[PDB]
Design a protein around this ligand. Structure first.
Ligand code: I52
Ligand code: CA
Ligand code: CA
Ligand code: ZN
Ligand code: ZN
Length: 163
């Protein structure tokens, strides 16, 4: 068994299952659907990962909102600030991402762009963590995609984490 682990079998296997717990209205429903598929390819384009969407057998990664209550450690906030987040890798809880409730995400000329806000959370849902690099994707600063630019910093972390 390689070595001992912290009980949680860190996610690490092709074929992934994900299910949004509730599309958002700020943008088209079929649009949020595309912003996620594109995003899927935005991160799958850097590795032969296989994503599978479900809607009845639950999913390893569960997406939704943050709500005002929640309990995490920062209820409500509106404005930019917290835009979303996910829990460490694991089963059920590991792989879920929460998006800000009162906000305006859209695949149009909005500002957060479901494809962008998700991309970032599409990297955290995995395991990589902020590396301090500002020009990185996991960087601690929100950078809109005026030209969608990737970064090996991720191709590398996702390379040893997958291919
Ligand atoms: C498309 C390719 C181009 C990529 C460019 C590119 C480059 C950098 C970024 C970027 O930095 N995005 C981003 C950063 C923070 C948050 S956030 O406010 O929810 N947030 C941080 C909030 N805050 C500051 C630092 O982290 C701790 C506290 C949460 C978090 O880490 N989620 O993963 C946490 C609160 C859970 C959300 C998105 C995006 C695109
Ligand atoms: Ca917010
Ligand atoms: Ca999960
Ligand atoms: Zn949460
Ligand atoms: Zn982050």
């Amino acid at each position: 068994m390689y070595n001992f682990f912290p009980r949680k079998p860190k996610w690490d296997k092709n074929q992934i299952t994900y299910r949004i717990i509730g599309y958002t209205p700020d943008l088209d429903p079929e649009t949020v659907d595309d912003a996620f598929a594109r995003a899927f390819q935005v991160w799958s384009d850097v590795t032969p990962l296989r994503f599978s969407r479900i809607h009845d057998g639950e999913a390893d990664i569960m997406i939704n909102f943050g709500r005002w209550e929640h309990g995490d450690g920062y209820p409500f906030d509106g404005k930019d600030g917290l835009l979303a987040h996910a829990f460490a890798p694991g089963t059920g809880v590991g792989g879920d991402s929460h998006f800000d409730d009162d906000e305006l995400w859209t695949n149009t000329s909005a500002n957060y762009s479901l494809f962008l806000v998700a991309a970032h959370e599409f990297g955290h849902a995995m395991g990589l963590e902020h590396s301090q690099d500002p020009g990185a994707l996991m960087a601690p600063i929100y950078t809109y995609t005026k030209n969608f630019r990737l970064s090996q910093d991720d191709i590398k972390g996702i390379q040893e984490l997958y291919g």
